[PDB]
Design an enzyme around this catalytic site. Structure first.
Site, mmCIF file in Angstrom:
data_model
loop_
_atom_site.group_PDB
_atom_site.id
_atom_site.type_symbol
_atom_site.label_atom_id
_atom_site.label_comp_id
_atom_site.label_asym_id
_atom_site.label_seq_id
_atom_site.Cartn_x
_atom_site.Cartn_y
_atom_site.Cartn_z
ATOM 1 N N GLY A 29 -4.491 -4.369 -36.878
ATOM 2 C CA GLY A 29 -5.765 -4.546 -36.200
ATOM 3 C C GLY A 29 -5.659 -5.306 -34.897
ATOM 4 O O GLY A 29 -4.622 -5.907 -34.618
ATOM 5 N N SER A 30 -6.720 -5.280 -34.095
ATOM 6 C CA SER A 30 -6.704 -5.961 -32.806
ATOM 7 C C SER A 30 -6.400 -7.463 -32.933
ATOM 8 O O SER A 30 -5.478 -7.962 -32.265
ATOM 9 C CB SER A 30 -8.026 -5.723 -32.068
ATOM 10 N N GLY A 82 -6.410 -10.211 -40.278
ATOM 11 C CA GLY A 82 -7.815 -10.445 -40.012
ATOM 12 C C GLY A 82 -8.632 -9.985 -41.209
ATOM 13 O O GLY A 82 -8.091 -9.716 -42.273
ATOM 14 N N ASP A 84 -12.715 -7.937 -42.301
ATOM 15 C CA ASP A 84 -13.961 -7.332 -41.845
ATOM 16 C C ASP A 84 -15.102 -8.344 -42.064
ATOM 17 O O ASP A 84 -16.082 -8.364 -41.314
ATOM 18 C CB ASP A 84 -14.223 -6.028 -42.604
ATOM 19 N N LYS A 94 -11.937 -6.192 -46.641
ATOM 20 C CA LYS A 94 -10.963 -5.667 -45.699
ATOM 21 C C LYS A 94 -10.834 -4.188 -45.930
ATOM 22 O O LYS A 94 -11.273 -3.703 -46.963
ATOM 23 C CB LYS A 94 -9.596 -6.344 -45.908
ATOM 24 N N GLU A 103 -2.035 -3.562 -47.027
ATOM 25 C CA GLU A 103 -2.442 -4.930 -46.713
ATOM 26 C C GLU A 103 -2.668 -5.739 -47.975
ATOM 27 O O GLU A 103 -2.325 -6.923 -48.039
ATOM 28 C CB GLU A 103 -3.746 -4.957 -45.914
ATOM 29 N N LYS A 121 -16.958 -12.514 -37.978
ATOM 30 C CA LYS A 121 -16.559 -12.057 -39.296
ATOM 31 C C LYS A 121 -17.048 -13.003 -40.379
ATOM 32 O O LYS A 121 -16.951 -12.692 -41.565
ATOM 33 C CB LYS A 121 -15.046 -11.951 -39.383
#
EC number: 5.3.1.6
Lengths: 219, 219
Positions: A29-30, A82, A84, A94, A103, A121
């Site tokens: 992810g970013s 990270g 969600d 996530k 993950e 988040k």
């Protein structure tokens, strides 16, 4: 600052958790991409990393960081990724994006889970962001019905197929007041492969990028 | 009689549970094969069947019985299948042979689960027969370690690959005193797709072929 720098400050903030001479579990992810960038910095100080996605692997590989398969490892000190959503009890949702299953498996092998994320988040009660659920295709309809019975509105991500060749059901409208009981209830449904609820095994540490800096939540 | 006729008497014994005008969920394996044979008898009296394995499907198809996919069905009145073991509490161990995942998904859609088996499948405490566990390949080692931690000796069935492209770990030496808690504990392990423990959803009825006839256990 800007949402993206809030994702960079937190990416580098986590570098303080990387310990020399160890293997690092990295997310996707970013937000995680910024941690990889920071980790490249310690190339030569660590043994390598166990990657949760091809994207990540390809980027780690590109920074001269050796990537071990998850079956070339016995355990993991840390896993940095990270989320969600994350509530006050460090439980998360996530999977919205990629690698839901990988993950979660790497996080199970990791001793400490470090969640890196911008302030958006953070939530009171998990549920606003649709809860992803990976299921064996042949059981899509079956699981869709159980999820309805559990209180959510399953919406099959038509077109998508996991790397494990499965489909995804995104569950909307749930007000997951007890993430542990909900993870358990869905993990009990035959056909279900992975529920995007990291509740029995949540974050141990959370680095949250706030305009006022980066708050660190523990335990 | 002979172990095999004990499997035939019980196959036909279950035919009394088939209700005219309905769809039947059928299992897989030798014992179930005898039920299919008996079911062919009511071809024309029922709507069809939902099959748990290609073998079964190919056989149902051959008896002129229409086979519906599991996604062409809303629910199921009954599912008739055998078991590797079944205790006094109607909880079973299944999956030693084929179709562990499909069998469990169809049983979750079925209202009533009818277990057909010779007396040798009856046990006091589940565990003697190795507990099969289907897992995402990338997590084989991970799950192997958790199973050890749970008290069993995982033995990977080298060479085998599920139709869902997964591997199987057969867990030996466990003395599964509380099948429900054990099914829950293993379903909680990321990487685990299916545990051959039908404990939260066990048999509702059991037709057991005993040399003295066929005993019927209920509730």
């Amino acid at each position: 600052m800007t949402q993206d720098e809030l994702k960079k400050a937190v990416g580098w903030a986590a570098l303080q958790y990387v310990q020399p001479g160890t293997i690092v579990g990295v997310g996707t992810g970013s937000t995680a991409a910024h941690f990889i960038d920071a980790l490249g910095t310690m190339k030569g100080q660590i043994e390598g990393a166990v990657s949760s996605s091809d994207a990540s692997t390809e980027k780690l590989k590109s920074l001269g960081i050796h990537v071990f398969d998850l079956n070339e490892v016995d355990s993991l000190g840390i896993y940095v990724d990270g989320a969600d959503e994350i509530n006050g009890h460090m439980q998360m949702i996530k999977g919205g994006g990629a690698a839901l299953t990988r993950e979660k498996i790497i996080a199970s092998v990791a001793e400490k889970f470090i969640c890196i994320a911008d302030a958006s988040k953070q939530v009171d009660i998990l549920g606003k962001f649709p809860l992803p659920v990976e299921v064996i295709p042949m059981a899509r309809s079956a699981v869709a019905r159980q999820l309805v019975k559990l209180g959510g509105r399953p919406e099959y991500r038509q077109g998508v197929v996991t790397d494990n060749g499965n489909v995804i059901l995104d569950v909307h409208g749930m007000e997951i007041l007890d993430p542990i009981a909900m993870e358990n209830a869905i993990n009990a449904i035959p056909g279900v492969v992975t529920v995007g609820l990291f509740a029995n095994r949540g974050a141990d540490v959370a680095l949250i990028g706030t305009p006022d800096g980066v708050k660190t939540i523990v335990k």
